[PDB]
Amino acid sequence: HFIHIITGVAVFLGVSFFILSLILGYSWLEAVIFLIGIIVANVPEGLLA
Amino acid sequence: GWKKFLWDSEKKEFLGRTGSSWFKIFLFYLIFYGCLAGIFIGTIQVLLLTLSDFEPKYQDRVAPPGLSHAPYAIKTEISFSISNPKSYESFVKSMHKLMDLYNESSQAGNSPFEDCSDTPADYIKRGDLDDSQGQKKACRFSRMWLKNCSGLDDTTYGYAEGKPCVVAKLNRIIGFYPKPLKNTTDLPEELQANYNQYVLPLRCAAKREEDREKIGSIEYFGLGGYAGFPLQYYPYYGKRLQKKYLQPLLAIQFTNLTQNMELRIECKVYGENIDYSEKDRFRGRFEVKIEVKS
Amino acid sequence: GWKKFLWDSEKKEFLGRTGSSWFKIFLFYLIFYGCLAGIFIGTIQVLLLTLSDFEPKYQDRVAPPGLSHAPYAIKTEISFSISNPKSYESFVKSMHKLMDLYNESSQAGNSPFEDCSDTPADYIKRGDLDDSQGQKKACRFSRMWLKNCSGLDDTTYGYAEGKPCVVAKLNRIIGFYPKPLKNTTDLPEELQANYNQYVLPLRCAAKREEDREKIGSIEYFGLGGYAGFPLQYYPYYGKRLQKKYLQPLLAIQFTNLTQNMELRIECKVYGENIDYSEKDRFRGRFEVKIEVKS
Amino acid sequence: EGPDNDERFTYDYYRLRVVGLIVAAVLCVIGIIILLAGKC
Amino acid sequence: EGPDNDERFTYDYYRLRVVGLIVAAVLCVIGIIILLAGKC
Amino acid sequence: LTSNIPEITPFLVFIIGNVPLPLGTVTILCIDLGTDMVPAISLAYEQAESDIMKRQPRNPKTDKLVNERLISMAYGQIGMIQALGGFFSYFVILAENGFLPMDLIGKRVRWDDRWISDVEDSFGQQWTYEQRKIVEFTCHTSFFISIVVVQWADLIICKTRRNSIFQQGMKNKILIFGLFEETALAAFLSYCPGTDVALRMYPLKPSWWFCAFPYSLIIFLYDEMRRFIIRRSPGGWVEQETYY
Amino acid sequence: RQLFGGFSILLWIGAILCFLAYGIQAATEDEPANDNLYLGVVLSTVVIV
């Protein structure tokens, strides 16, 4: 359950970091590279083990 | 010098500096002493936290308990004339101050005072040292129990005709259980008779072997007629958990006292967790100098 | 759920808590993040104090000095067509940006520029690293010294007819004294002729043995006509103590360059406190790929 | 905590004095060693 | 401070590495000793 | 969950504020594998506080493992502090090597360009490409160490949630093992002769190791008081808000 | 499921990409660098452990 919520929070922030990057002039590609990295860094790893 | 040091009008200086300087130094000292005050207050608050409200963290200094008395005698001497009434006033005012707290009017209603055995009994535990069951209940102690020294019949308490009383009291200690000596073959001479286990014995005597003869009849008044303190009034739970608590008292009448002569009377309590000290002359025992000069 | 979690009207809650709760939590976080910000700012101010304004505390990373160049070539390649003018524009714009700082109009008046020997000379010490004698004085460096690459005659600087120039420059280091190699029997082949002690030599060559033949006449332009840097422009006292300071420059014309072929040219400076690195290809030396395809 | 709660009124001052003396002796020794190192 | 002020551009990284390694080895040993004290 | 904040804040200031990258890929992998594996396992082995049986049972409906309070202590309060501690070691390394703080805002665009061998610092010196990359890497290593140093504190405060460590005691041997071993990993990787070429970590000078010390003591003292207030005032504001 | 699950998959990519970065280098540029080869050798060792 928890993991689910966090994932929701993470996906949101990813899209946001996307609009911020383009309002500041990054390359269309750099914004997706950032979305992928941020969502990977917000979801915790190991909890169930 | 005289004028230039007090006030010069070229550099605009008073006592030695100008305006902006006095303002900067005063402002600095105000801010500095404010940081100092705030830090001291914080380090003192953490200490007020650390401790508990129902129990002193260290109880090794007040142990075992002392033995105080009323009246309030300076240098442990009770000297008064049987004729001049303005001689024993300072004593009666004290005795009265002490007994004035055992008035029945104060001990009224069901709370927070409850009736206890009219005869000495055992300990009574009202729980732990918490706030769970609210204010605990303390046993009532009636004035009348003290027979001839109660201020109810002869307000003076005896000082009027050469027969004084001395209300002895045991120092209140939190969680202290009094333990009397057992009936085994080793026990002082005095204590053998009337060995009520539930009573802590108090017995007075003469400091010197000579004074024995000059001291008359020591008549002790107390709970149940015994010369001691009933174990049922223990233990003491502290002010916060037992407000309106009364400690037992023991009256001592020194009847048949020789006239015009200083008598040294030493009173002493007995018990297991009771120990005397050669330095503190009030730990467990006490000394009184009586001289009824008339 | 849907409604109760958003707004209920019995407990007066929004998103889960009531008003006084949101106010207490928000107030706590504001005060907390304020203490955090203040502490970080103080610990950073002590660091801004610790250091000196005229000298970096550590000078082991920028040593020895590098060797940069204009133009600004990406991947160290200078490729341009002699016909299409829109091919060498990115290069000329850079070359011009660099030379635009040596305009005589900027170096005007007595201050803070002073005239120095028209021929290479020795070091010049303008004192210690203090603020005692104010802003120091730096030697003037005229544009015209560079003969065929100055943008004053042929603005393009050569790229127009297959003869490019390369203005080399030594990285500015505070308190760095350049030390050239001595006349002893051990010295590279090239350096023997024109051993002006006061000049730091710069000499370009071909990376591979084959390319030698395909490279034509390397014509160096500099102070006094030598292929080096005059020692008189050292040492450098730093921006704070020597604003409006100009570093020497050396022009290199690669005349007679084979057409339609990539040529790897490696330039290298020589000296005692000069050392190269197999990892940093800009420490002391530099590489350029030139291909004048037409 | 029961009638026999005598521990609540006892303190091991003996061990405290022993440790305090060991420490005092050690600090003093360190002192002499530093003050005289070299005979000057 | 004169032409021969080369010291201002030198650092003894060798000694630093030696000391850092001695310390690392010591801390690691302390660790093993504590983790295994008793064979459990 | 606390180490998440220091690993993400660098990638944020880097993109927004345009400064040189404070934490990289190799260093981040070092943090996850070093301070989060063995210290975490040691916690399982912890003993019981002397309150375990002197406390009421739990209502599963009202009390959950992951509630809105855990994220309050980890992300919000403790995390932000480990982040500031690593940022100090970063600012210090650059200021000493010539790059000051005011001049750092915006140098990224120019910093990350292999071609500008002329990068000018505050004191006016001119830097090449690897000469400035070396200082940046000395910052990655310092950040790393500042993280292990702050972790020391986070781990100590994690042993108990209601009692102090002076009450609970340092009798856990595995947790100690973890403190000494991590410290060793950081000293080893920073000083070994060859990590430069392979992992990209550079030696740390001695005055730098101490930059994270003030932030490590503040975390410990804060949690200690945070607890004193709990023990004294049940059902208060602190227990409603920070007791996880 | 262990070495090839869901979070490790991304790391498996980092390793792939880096190796391709070294090949285009050694095949093209004379005297290349090696930060990519050791990056791959380090990443792979992490997924394995």
Ligand SMILES: C=C(/C=C\C[C@@H](O)[C@@H](O)[C@H](O)C/C=C/C=C\[C@@H](O)C[C@@H]1O[C@H](C[C@@H](O)[C@H](O)C[C@H]2O[C@H]([C@H](O)[C@H](O)CC[C@H](O)/C=C/[C@H](C)[C@@H](O)C[C@]3(O)O[C@H](C[C@@H](O)CCCCCCC[C@@]45C[C@@H](C)C[C@@](C)(O4)[C@@H](C[C@@H](C)CCCCC[C@@H](O)[C@H](O)[C@H](O)[C@@H](O)[C@H](O)[C@H]4O[C@H](C[C@H](O)[C@H](O)/C(C)=C/[C@H](O)C[C@@H](C)[C@H](O)C(=O)N/C=C/C(=O)NCCCO)[C@H](O)[C@@H](O)[C@@H]4O)O5)[C@H](O)[C@@H](O)[C@H]3O)C[C@@H](O)[C@@H]2O)[C@@H](O)[C@H](O)[C@H]1O)CC[C@H](O)[C@@H](O)[C@H](O)[C@H](C)C[C@H]1O[C@H](/C=C\[C@@H](O)[C@H](O)C[C@@H]2C[C@@H]3C[C@H](O2)[C@@H](CC[C@H]2O[C@H](CN)C[C@H]2O)O3)[C@@H](O)[C@H](O)[C@H]1O
């Ligand atoms: C593995 C990963 C993947 C990759 C890894 C990667 O890194 C590496 O493996 C490398 O790959 C290695 C691989 C190597 C492979 C091979 C190599 O070996 C070999 C060598 O490679 C070399 C290359 C290499 O050297 C390279 O450099 C590598 C780097 O690559 C990336 C580069 O940057 C960049 O790509 C350079 C490449 C090039 O530039 C590409 C350009 C584009 C493709 C394209 O544009 C070019 C071109 O046009 O493409 C054409 C093809 C077209 O069909 C395509 C169609 C386009 C579609 C258009 C639609 C756009 C779009 C899309 C919509 C959705 C939205 C929308 C808004 O935009 C919408 C709007 C529409 C309407 C727009 C329409 C526009 C039209 C455009 C199109 O038409 C086309 O452009 C057009 O057709 C063109 O033809 C035409 O020319 C057009 O030109 C112009 C167009 C414009 O340009 C363009 O449009 C522009 C500008 C748009 C702008 O946005 C506009 C703005 C201004 C804006 O509008 C604006 O004004 N705003 C103004 C605002 C304003 O005023 N405000 C004022 C305010 C007033 O108040 C013109 O305008 C147009 O008109 C015109 O039409 O529609 C076509 O081909 C050509 O045309 C072509 O030219 C970057 C990297 O990838 C890589 O480094 C080669 O050079 C070499 O030759 C080769 O040998 C995952 C990543 C990791 O996960 C992540 O970590 C990641 O690594 C980090 C993020 C990295 C970052 O950090 C690094 C450092 C450390 C990191 O690693 C850390 O790790 C970070 C981490 C991350 C996280 C967080 C944290 O930190 C950590 C925490 C983790 C912890 O927590 C954990 C717990 N779980 C634990 C622990 O792990 O993890 C850094 O080092 C990184 O740098 C950094 O990034």
Ligand SMILES: CCCCCCCC/C=C\CCCCCCCC(=O)OC[C@H](COP(=O)(O)OCC[N+](C)(C)C)OC(=O)CCCCCCC/C=C\CCCCCCCC
């Ligand atoms: C150049 C440097 C040279 C240094 C060489 C040092 C060599 C080592 C020598 C001594 C080391 C420590 C010795 C430990 C023994 C200490 C004796 C002790 O632990 O005694 C404790 C009892 C006290 O009674 P209590 O606690 O029950 O009382 C009741 C307490 N209440 C009132 C609070 C309830 O002792 C008693 O009863 C009986 C006491 C008998 C006499 C003890 C003598 C103590 C005085 C001096 C010796 C320490 C010298 C240290 C030198 C330092 C240099 C500045």
Ligand SMILES: CCCCCCCC/C=C\CCCCCCCC(=O)OC[C@H](COP(=O)(O)OCC[N+](C)(C)C)OC(=O)CCCCCCC/C=C\CCCCCCCC
């Ligand atoms: C169970 C526990 C058992 C523990 C037992 C430990 C026994 C003691 C063993 C070692 C103690 C310390 C040994 C000291 C020698 C270290 C070697 C050294 O000082 O090398 C330094 C030089 C590096 O060159 P440079 O500084 O001039 O470069 C230029 C630097 N720049 C780029 C910044 C300008 O070395 C060189 O050149 C040549 C290097 C040759 C190879 C050196 C090997 C170093 C790698 C591992 C040995 C250390 C193991 C420690 C174990 C700790 C357990 C975690």
Ligand SMILES: CCCCCCCC/C=C\CCCCCCCC(=O)OC[C@H](COP(=O)(O)OCC[N+](C)(C)C)OC(=O)CCCCCCC/C=C\CCCCCCCC
């Ligand atoms: C090279 C690196 C070195 C690192 C050094 C780190 C030093 C530590 C840093 C700060 C220490 C101060 C933190 C004080 C926080 C308050 C702690 C507190 O309030 O604890 C309360 C507890 C009382 O618990 P209780 O009665 O409920 O237990 C009942 C147990 N039952 C239930 C069995 C009866 O008290 C206790 O445990 C008694 C414990 C007393 C400990 C006092 C320590 C303070 C002394 C100096 C502090 C340093 C000051 C400035 C230093 C700058 C240094 C350069």
Ligand SMILES: CCCCCCCC/C=C\CCCCCCCC(=O)OC[C@H](COP(=O)(O)OCC[N+](C)(C)C)OC(=O)CCCCCCC/C=C\CCCCCCCC
């Ligand atoms: C320059 C400034 C730096 C400031 C940086 C801040 C760093 C972090 C700040 C503070 C963290 C350290 C605090 C250490 C706390 C010591 C507390 C202590 O002493 O509480 C005494 C205990 C209690 O005893 P009890 O019998 O009454 O308990 C009865 C327990 N019941 C009731 C369950 C039976 O006694 C015991 O725990 C038994 C004895 C245990 C002795 C432990 C000694 C080791 C402590 C730390 C190890 C160092 C790790 C760092 C590694 C890096 C080194 C390079």
Ligand SMILES: CCCCCCCC/C=C\CCCCCCCC(=O)OC[C@H](COP(=O)(O)OCC[N+](C)(C)C)OC(=O)CCCCCCC/C=C\CCCCCCCC
């Ligand atoms: C617990 C997990 C947490 C962390 C896990 C991290 C995972 C990483 C896994 C593997 C990383 C492997 C790194 C390989 C080490 C270097 C190998 C290498 O590629 O080196 C190349 C260099 C050559 O450089 P160059 O010629 O360009 O230098 C020119 C210098 N100029 C020009 C200034 C003079 O070689 C040299 O310098 C010679 C020096 C050789 C270095 C010897 C050190 C031995 C390395 C590892 C053994 C330690 C294991 C720990 C055992 C603990 C026992 C208790």
Ligand SMILES: CCCCCCCC/C=C\CCCCCCCC(=O)OC[C@H](COP(=O)(O)OCC[N+](C)(C)C)OC(=O)CCCCCCC/C=C\CCCCCCCC
């Ligand atoms: C490099 C620096 C290293 C050292 C840094 C140290 C920083 C840590 C210092 C303090 C820790 C801050 C903890 C924050 C918690 C405060 C929260 C608070 O406000 O909680 C107040 C509670 C009230 O609870 P309640 O149930 O009545 O609320 C009923 C509420 N209703 C009515 C709404 C239901 O408690 C009360 O009011 C009474 C309790 C008040 C406790 C004050 C404790 C002050 C202790 C230390 C501060 C001094 C440090 C000095 C250092 C100088 C450094 C330069």
Ligand SMILES: CC(C)CCC[C@@H](C)[C@H]1CC[C@H]2[C@@H]3CC=C4C[C@@H](O)CC[C@]4(C)[C@H]3CC[C@]12C
């Ligand atoms: C210059 C700086 C470091 C001084 C900071 C002083 C701090 C520690 C002082 C300033 C005002 C103080 C507070 C003033 C009033 C109260 C109310 C009391 O019922 C509990 C303590 C409490 C909450 C004090 C705690 C300590 C406190 C916050």
Ligand SMILES: CC(C)CCC[C@@H](C)[C@H]1CC[C@H]2[C@@H]3CC=C4C[C@@H](O)CC[C@]4(C)[C@H]3CC[C@]12C
């Ligand atoms: C909660 C507590 C401990 C935070 C205290 C923060 C202190 C250290 C902060 C608060 C405001 C800060 C000051 C703000 C402005 C300036 C002016 C600048 O030109 C020098 C530093 C100086 C003088 C700062 C020094 C540090 C300072 C005094």
Ligand SMILES: CC(C)CCC[C@@H](C)[C@H]1CC[C@H]2[C@@H]3CC=C4C[C@@H](O)CC[C@]4(C)[C@H]3CC[C@]12C
């Ligand atoms: C100033 C720095 C460098 C050293 C500080 C040393 C301090 C911490 C030392 C000096 C003297 C020491 C005390 C000496 C004697 C005793 C008595 C013993 O029964 C308990 C410890 C106690 C109370 C010591 C505690 C630590 C102590 C206070």
Ligand SMILES: CC(C)CCC[C@@H](C)[C@H]1CC[C@H]2[C@@H]3CC=C4C[C@@H](O)CC[C@]4(C)[C@H]3CC[C@]12C
């Ligand atoms: C937390 C408490 C109990 C212990 C704190 C230990 C700290 C002070 C220790 C842990 C590791 C140590 C470092 C290990 C290695 C070196 C390299 C050497 O060339 C200078 C000293 C230096 C930089 C040490 C300084 C002290 C140090 C940082």
Ligand code: NA
């Ligand atoms: Na992780």
Ligand code: NA
């Ligand atoms: Na983590």
